[PDB]
Design a protein around this ligand. Structure first.
Ligand SMILES: [Zn+2]
Ligand SMILES: [Zn+2]
Ligand SMILES: [Zn+2]
Ligand SMILES: [Zn+2]
Length: 133
């Protein structure tokens, strides 16, 4: 069946919301301040997907050379604190990406997939560490 010619318009592809105010730059303001699926990186001040934040910090951020990956929790840690982080063994261990999503804000492992990401970050009684919520 025919896809609407303007289906990709007035839509935030990250949280799914549609709105007349979501013009091309109504969307830029949406990402910068409001979208529950995104965050501003405190280190480089860019907007990033929360579900991509660890990968951002380790491989993309302007400040990526200041982070290393904890092989226990899979999260980015400041390079200087990583030995102590590793020694303290207090982080929540990670699971295979096919088995679980991992929230970098609250450190929970949960049901994999995009629908789960949305329910965790935007749903009721979901993520307690999402500062836009
Ligand atoms: Zn959004
Ligand atoms: Zn960054
Ligand atoms: Zn760790
Ligand atoms: Zn969370």
């Amino acid at each position: 069946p025919h896809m609407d010619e303007h289906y990709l318009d007035n839509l935030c592809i990250f949280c799914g919301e549609r709105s007349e105010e979501f013009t091309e730059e109504g969307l830029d303001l949406h990402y910068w301040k409001h979208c529950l699926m995104l965050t501003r990186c405190d280190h480089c001040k860019q907007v990033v997907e929360i579900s991509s934040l660890t990968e951002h910090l380790l491989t993309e951020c302007d400040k990526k050379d200041g982070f290393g990956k904890c092989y226990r929790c899979s999260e980015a840690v400041f390079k200087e604190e990583l030995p102590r982080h590793i020694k303290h063994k207090d982080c929540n261990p990670a699971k295979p990406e096919k088995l679980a999503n991992r929230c970098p804000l609250c450190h929970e492992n949960f049901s994999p997939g995009e629908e789960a990401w949305k329910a965790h970050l935007m749903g009721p009684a979901g993520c307690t560490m999402n500062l836009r919520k």
